[PDB]
Design a protein around this ligand. Sequence first.
Ligand SMILES: NS(=O)(=O)c1c(F)c(NC2CCCCCCC2)c(S(=O)(=O)CCCO)c(N2CCCCC2)c1F
Ligand SMILES: NS(=O)(=O)c1c(F)c(NC2CCCCCCC2)c(S(=O)(=O)CCCO)c(N2CCCCC2)c1F
Ligand SMILES: [Zn+2]
Ligand SMILES: [Zn+2]
Lengths: 260, 260
Amino acid sequence: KWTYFGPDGENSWSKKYPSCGGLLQSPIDLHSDILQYDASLTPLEFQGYNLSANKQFLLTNNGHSVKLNLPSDMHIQGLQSRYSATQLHLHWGNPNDPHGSEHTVSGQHFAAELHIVHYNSDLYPDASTASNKSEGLAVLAVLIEMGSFNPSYDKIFSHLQHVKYKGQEAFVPGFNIEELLPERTAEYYRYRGSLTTPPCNPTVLWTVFRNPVQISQEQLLALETALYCTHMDDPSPREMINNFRQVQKFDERLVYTSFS
Amino acid sequence: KWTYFGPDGENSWSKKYPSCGGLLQSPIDLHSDILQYDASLTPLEFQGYNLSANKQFLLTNNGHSVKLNLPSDMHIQGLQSRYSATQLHLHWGNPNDPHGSEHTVSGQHFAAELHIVHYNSDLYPDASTASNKSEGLAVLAVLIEMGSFNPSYDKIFSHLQHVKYKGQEAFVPGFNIEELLPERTAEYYRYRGSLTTPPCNPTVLWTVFRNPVQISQEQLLALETALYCTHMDDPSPREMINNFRQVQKFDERLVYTSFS
Ligand SMILES: NS(=O)(=O)c1c(F)c(NC2CCCCCCC2)c(S(=O)(=O)CCCO)c(N2CCCCC2)c1F
Ligand SMILES: NS(=O)(=O)c1c(F)c(NC2CCCCCCC2)c(S(=O)(=O)CCCO)c(N2CCCCC2)c1F
Ligand SMILES: [Zn+2]
Ligand SMILES: [Zn+2]
């Protein structure tokens, strides 16, 4: 139905998912010509992010990324509405071009990107209901680069060998999800955009933190090499690589920054 | 029918032109991970580029860009087949984001981009016949950076105020098209790609010169502000800006370089 490579790739999403050719598409290149400092932008607070290690959270290969289900007890404070968490997931490149972030900064890719997806729990009863509705979603984006071994990201990566193929599932003990966030979360880019996957609904308030996190080259290579887009009974297996969208046109619109 | 913005923009081109969602699409980001030095990439020979000053060549605003007809007497020597010229045209951004090249270098746009389009006159009797066939097209790309005034590009730009609206035409007296090429044309990127506009045929052997040319801010501002996508008789004029395609995915494709 949709992929990031070949005839069902991103240039063809709009055939069956019209909003992929519509307004407010993400991701974008964050560059001086479209940035404006906004002193009204306050620091986000993260509530309920300390998940119990005695509780289990579902990790799934859905054929396009690895996703961790998150409880609606997790909230963002500091937006117009309360947003409650629904799931997180990643995007990455491939071992021969390990530059697979969705957002770029001054034209530069990072190695990977984390998305923590939330829904407007003040207006809507669940993420599905919010997904295609006004003010429906808020996503936190974390840029990832190569550096030191990251024990917090390994709380996810250590389970990759159990979700190699589409539909496979594994359980991840709770941990504090703030451990996936960078330093100085108070510095971020803010803009109105979309899901970066089908159905590409233009319903996302994006927060891209300025500062990346670091994972080891070994961790990045495990992520890049562990997973497949296909079912375990598929005679045509496809490696799950390059699962990021290209940057979108961003014309006569602004990205707001919390830093000058 | 196709545009660079809004509903008929580039994410929807594949609904209209099947090749725009197919393989080998251009333009691409030229970055280190995908570059491979190739000592077989010897200098092209530009033959008949010094156009007869007693001839005139048609400059047309076709609603998407400004194009100059070139004669088949112009050809590239040094490829397996001779390629004969058909036209040149430009791509640019807008005054608030004057970074409208199609190819990027290490994630960076240049101000604008010149394309000189050729067809395989050894294999095919004309450009329209060559365009959907094996090895049918060769395009030279010149990156354009903000810098010194360029008297050679002004041989084109001095006519922009006579092709302001869609369908309008002006004659350009023959001049030396080689004056539009950068320093050290022996230094280039080479790859297999496509038209960067509908119909997006995957039939183009691309040569992107390594070194940009310079035009002044004043020349760039004239290119970004002179032209409209609409007919003169349209009282709702639409500026011709940002007429470049976003870079495409490029995996299991390499770019070959004549420089290391
Ligand atoms: N990058 S992103 O932040 O835009 C973003 C999302 F937001 C949502 N899911 C959201 C959950 C809300 C409830 C219904 C679905 C809408 C979006 C999802 S999703 O899991 O729900 C799949 C939805 C349909 O493709 C994804 N994927 C795409 C497939 C790989 C896993 C992450 C995503 F990449
Ligand atoms: N960027 S590019 O170099 O790929 C490239 C081309 F190559 C060709 N022309 C090719 C050769 C001449 C006509 C035969 C069909 C193939 C197109 C053309 S074209 O004039 O022939 C139009 C083709 C239909 O849209 C264009 N345009 C797109 C619109 C504005 C003017 C330049 C182009 F941008
Ligand atoms: Zn995502
Ligand atoms: Zn072109």
